[PDB]
Symmetry: C3
Subunit: 239 residues, 3 copies
Amino acid sequence: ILDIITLTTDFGTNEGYVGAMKGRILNILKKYNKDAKIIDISHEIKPFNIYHGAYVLLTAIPYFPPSVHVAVIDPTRKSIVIETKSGYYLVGPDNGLFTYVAEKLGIKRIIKIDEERRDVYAVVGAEILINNGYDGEELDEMVKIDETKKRVIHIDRFGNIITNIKKDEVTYYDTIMIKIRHKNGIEKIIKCKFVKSYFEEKNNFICLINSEGFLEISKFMDNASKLLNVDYLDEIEIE
Amino acid sequence: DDILDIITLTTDFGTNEGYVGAMKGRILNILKKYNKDAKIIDISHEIKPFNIYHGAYVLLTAIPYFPPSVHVAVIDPTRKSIVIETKSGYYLVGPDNGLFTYVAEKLGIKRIIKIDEERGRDVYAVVGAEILINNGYDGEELDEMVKIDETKKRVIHIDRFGNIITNIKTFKTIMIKIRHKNGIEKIIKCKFVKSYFEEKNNFICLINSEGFLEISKFMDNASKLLNVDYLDEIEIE
Amino acid sequence: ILDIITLTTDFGTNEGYVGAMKGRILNILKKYNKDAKIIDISHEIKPFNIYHGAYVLLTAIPYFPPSVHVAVIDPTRKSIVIETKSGYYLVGPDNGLFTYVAEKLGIKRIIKIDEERGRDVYAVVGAEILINNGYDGEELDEMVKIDETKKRVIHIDRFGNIITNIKKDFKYYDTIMIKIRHKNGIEKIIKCKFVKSYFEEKNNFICLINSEGFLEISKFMDNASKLLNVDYLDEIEIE
């Protein structure tokens, strides 16, 4: 029984788009007398950044019980409804947004949303709540964020540089040499000390495994991102 | 359903303080004291401080999509308070200063009630919850209300991207003249288009999702580039 | 019966931590079919600033009806559950965070939390209290409290107003002399007009009693904290 619907957008709160979305959903639900809880994950995803969105979805969703998750972030086409092994429904565009969250929870079926209607996502999400599921044209694959090439995965509110590299891929207190190439060609090489906490090796750059299992580059009381001029997608090379 | 179950909140309180929480708290406190079950939705709390033009535009964009319900909006540079019942039963609670202008017009005003002393941020809250409990409101009626003049063409609101939205609801290189507050006038050339992608080299104007003529600049902030703010006069020619 | 649970953090929403916390609680809640409202008080508390948090909690909570409140801000770990006279429960670090709210509501009992499980602990412990409508464990005698006898800066407004420790206990319109000692050591002396509204005396620095009953320093349409360069915990002396 589907009970929760979550929203994750890059709309911001300066506008009233998010509110509209809640209104639509809320309207449909009341018309079919379907009680459900609307939960906000985040509306501060950086405009058009599917990677940022992908990372926040990966961090929040797995902690919810089976439920519906609407995520609207697309720098513009294709849009899907994903069904997870355990029965989670992921509403949103087909551009990679759900890549990580999809793998984590397991893909059971990919159903293409058909134009029988932006505000599509909201409606589709509500529909899934009332009908407690969704049916439609099953699809072969889905657009997926290439996870083979190591790069800057996400950037913190503090400016910490979160990488692709998972704990299971990295051989403590040793000195690592991280190479970072920006999209424009400039290349930066730094020396980090793989530690356990943020309060360690305060004098230099440090890298540790964060609460999501990825190698992250940080600088005590600073903003490594701004210090290295590192942006999303920069190529990472450890050695 | 003819039962009031939803109540939204729109403010310029921000989240740095606990005023928003205190408001949700008082609402909940009252709803419990009458075992009234209702959902509380936030539309936005990032309305620019004291800017009723920003609020009015946000309310217009979100409220129409909700089913009949109560909506508390608190943005006001210090007075006269009101409850507005729309045609389809919606209830708008807030200051009588033009805040509810656009939304009230699109939902049709059934009646405007005056809020007495009978009872402040924690005042629009009690009223909104009271409406939920009694499934309605009553008071001395008001003939007309304060309204944001929509006949004088000016900057309606400013996007998070810096886009300049005018209250111009046209025909078509457009030439737009702006009269800032101080009196200085600027004149720019816009390429009237359909999407934000077209004509990247120069300024562009277009009709946005809300239906108003909007000025923008590819991946940049027109508002800052032109130094345009709320209420600047617009003149197309 | 406990039906409401509020969240107050310094997590922000650039990340999915707040979402994971909502899901976590919801998950436990849907596993005992316990229905409850998850209210958001604020997630924009300044990172590690417990003074900021303590102030927000004092402002919002007393207006709620008896319920549960999870507040997560701590630069560090001792964890507690404060039970109020009227049945409110405060859940979070024993570092002074709940100092003001605790006194206002009145303490019935402070219970230590046995690490038999930190983002998740407070979450789990909160839902748990909702499911059982109460808590139990080793009782603690006293908690850490923010020293309120030491006159200083309580909080800083979003406008930049300097909120002080001094409660509603000189006269109106008089000219108060205020000395402020920063952390660095330097002292600043300013003259203030004790008024009753932010609009009066738009020329000089003014001070007044804010909606929380505290003496506040403000400057019409300007940021008092930035102008005087005042930070949290700066010592305040009136003469």
